[PDB]
Design a protein around this ligand. Structure first.
Ligand SMILES: O=C(O)C1=C[C@H](O)[C@@H](O)[C@@H](O[C@@H]2[C@H](O)[C@@H](O)[C@@H](O[C@@H]3[C@H](O)[C@@H](O)[C@@H](O)O[C@@H]3C(=O)O)O[C@@H]2C(=O)O)O1
Length: 609
């Protein structure tokens, strides 16, 4: 019936391929042509907390999957699903005979465990991941039969199929009950004895160490953790390693239109590189079969990238980024700097800071003129376009900026020429940045010089990714620089407009913590944010598309009125590459986190000619 990769003939112990596949495997139509088996996919990740590079290469294996044009989703791990007319009850039919990577059955037992015993367990997650919540309230997940599972939300949830296609929506398929139950007190009477083995002190830490989460490095650091991924870890991430190797999953659950069990490619090899510049040189020498993640936003190197295409044996292709802003200033409304906070919370202060910026210079210098000035709003083709949110305060007006700061009472000056607070102290903002992000650091250096003309001091504090996230969650920053999503993905990724993302809504993560705990932790936000949060809960629970359109447009307008985050430039074209020998890469796919790119292009059907 079906066939398998020749390298699998080398494992005597494997059942015949028809018995490893579901009775009805998901048939994957290829991007361009039917493929052939073999080869090793060479790509790259960074050394510091870059496990999402693996996830965005092999792809989240969720209940649904985006179409190539990201306009809709289709059943993926689920064979099919039905929705009740009121959008509250979702019933998923699973593929009979489907198996985990260890050969054991993948059934509704696994999805019910993942939801009820892990995701929805409040000791595991004191705040339930919001992907599964409606207005902060959880669904009831129940087994219908071995191959049918039901989600019952307490209100309409029109967007749940889209959520289930994003990386943060993939919990339902991430936890094998058999393996993970040994680390759960509800199942292992002796789970305590597992703590000393893993050097943890409680079972949630145990569960994270052994069974992982969406973005934890532990997801890729063991070989024994079962999954339904197209490739499995063989040489793990985590240690002081310079290379990660994944190998085809003999129990992968898909075929191509001729009946070949996928993936076509036998192995993936990630170079784990300590420094950016080395990635650039190896890429320009053709050492990577695909790179469409780390080098996409470095306009400085596309001349050499383009130049060495023929010598390196690769093709450069452009992608449209979903981000509204390539490098935006998240201003901390809950900055611990008491003197600064009195001005940070004033609209006109933030407006002055934006008017003192010269986005044409940033474009020219940091982006070789290939980006364009923008704040944080959706693009004009978006049904969510808001002119004010996109274009207010974009033109340099130093005189106007200085007049505002004068009017706010920052008219005293120190010996170096900077403005001071009325009661002493230089007007100074600390900006945290990831040191490996060259365009972002360069953006802050240009802004520092620009804001000096307004008598304001910007202080650059660079670190690797871990400490950068640690400082943010500690509320230890005045500014954080990173992308503003929303150009194309505003409802999937609304972090810049309302403080709902626990790690990335950095107008205040204490505000987000307040929202995500029902006001039990964190810092109560101001009236405009509490208003947007209430509207956001109404939007997620909207009964009709017209109500959802009205509600979310209200959120964007309030966000525009408030002007809480300051954009520099919307992204230039994303520069990606793949080997000329690598076939079936969708060179037209958009770029972005909610689609896990480049894995949106279905890497299980990439192949080498
Ligand atoms: O080289 C870069 O630094 C870079 C290239 C991308 O072209 C650019 O859009 C930007 O990627 C952002 C973000 O800076 C990067 O850290 C990563 O973040 C996502 C997600 O947004 C985060 O919330 C977290 O989940 O980690 C993710 C990850 O992939 O690690 O990717 C985004 C993006 O747009 O895809 O930086």
């Amino acid at each position: 019936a079906f066939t398998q990769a020749p390298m699998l003939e080398q494992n005597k112990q494997l059942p015949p391929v028809d018995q490893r596949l579901p009775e009805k495997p998901l048939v994957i139509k290829p991007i361009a042509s039917n493929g052939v088996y073999g080869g090793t996919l060479r790509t790259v990740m960074r050394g510091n907390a870059d496990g999402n590079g693996i996830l965005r290469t092999i792809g989240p294996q969720g209940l649904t999957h985006w179409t190539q044009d990201i306009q809709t989703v289709e059943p993926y791990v689920a064979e099919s699903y039905t929705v009740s007319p009121d959008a509250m009850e979702y019933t998923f039919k699973l593929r009979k005979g489907m198996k985990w990577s260890d050969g054991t059955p993948f059934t509704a037992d696994d999805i019910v465990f993942a939801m009820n015993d892990v995701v929805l367990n409040k000791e595991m997650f004191p705040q339930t991941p919001s992907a599964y919540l409606v207005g902060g309230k959880a669904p009831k997940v129940s087994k219908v039969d071995d191959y049918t599972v039901k989600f019952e939300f307490p209100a309409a949830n029109l967007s749940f199929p889209e959520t289930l296609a994003t990386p943060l929506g993939q919990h339902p398929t991430l936890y094998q009950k058999k393996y993970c139950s040994q680390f759960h007190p509800a199942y292992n009477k002796n789970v305590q004895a597992e703590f000393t083995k893993a050097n943890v002190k409680d079972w949630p830490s145990l569960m994270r160490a052994k069974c992982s989460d969406i973005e934890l490095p532990s997801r890729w650091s063991s070989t024994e953790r079962p999954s339904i991924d197209p490739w499995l870890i063989k040489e793990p991430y985590g240690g002081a390693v310079t290379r990660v190797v994944m190998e085809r999953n003999p129990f992968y659950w898909q075929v191509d239109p001729t009946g070949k069990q996928l993936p076509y490619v036998d192995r993936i090899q990630y170079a784990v590189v300590s420094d950016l510049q080395a990635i650039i040189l190896a890429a320009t020498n053709g050492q990577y079969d695909i790179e469409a993640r780390l080098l996409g936003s470095d306009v400085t190197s596309r001349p050499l990238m383009l130049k060495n295409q023929q010598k390196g044996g690769y093709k450069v292709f452009g992608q449209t980024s979903a981000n509204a802003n390539a490098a935006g200033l998240w201003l901390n409304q809950t900055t611990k700097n008491e003197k600064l906070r009195k001005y940070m919370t004033q609209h006109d202060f933030r407006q002055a800071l934006s008017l003192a910026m010269d986005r044409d210079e940033i474009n020219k210098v940091a982006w070789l003129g290939q980006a364009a000035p923008w704040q944080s709003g959706p693009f004009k083709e978006s049904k969510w376009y808001n002119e004010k949110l996109a274009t207010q305060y974009l033109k340099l007006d130093l005189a106007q900026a200085n007049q505002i700061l004068d009017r706010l009472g920052l008219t005293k000056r120190d010996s170096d020429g900077y403005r001071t607070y009325p009661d002493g102290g230089r007007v100074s903002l600390d900006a945290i940045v990831m040191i490996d992000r060259q365009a972002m650091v360069q953006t802050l250096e240009l802004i520092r010089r620009q804001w000096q003309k307004a008598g304001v001091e910007l202080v650059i504090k660079g670190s690797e990714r871990s400490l950068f996230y640690n400082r943010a969650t500690a509320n230890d920053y005045d500014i954080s620089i990173d992308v503003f999503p929303g150009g194309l993905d505003a409802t999937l990724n609304p972090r810049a407009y309302v403080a709902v993302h626990p790690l990335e809504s950095r107008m205040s993560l204490e505000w987000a913590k307040w929202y995500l705990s029902g006001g039990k932790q964190g810092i109560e936000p101001n009236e405009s944010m509490k208003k947007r949060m209430a509207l956001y809960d109404q939007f997620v629970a909207a009964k009709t598309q017209s109500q959802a359109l009205s509600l979310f447009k209200q959120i964007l307008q309030i966000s525009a009125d408030e002007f809480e985050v300051i954009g520099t430039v919307r992204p230039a074209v994303i520069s990606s590459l793949h080997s000329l020998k690598l076939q079936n890469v969708n060179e037209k796919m958009p770029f972005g986190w909610p689609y896990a790119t480049p894995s949106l292009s279905l890497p299980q059907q990439w192949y080498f000619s």
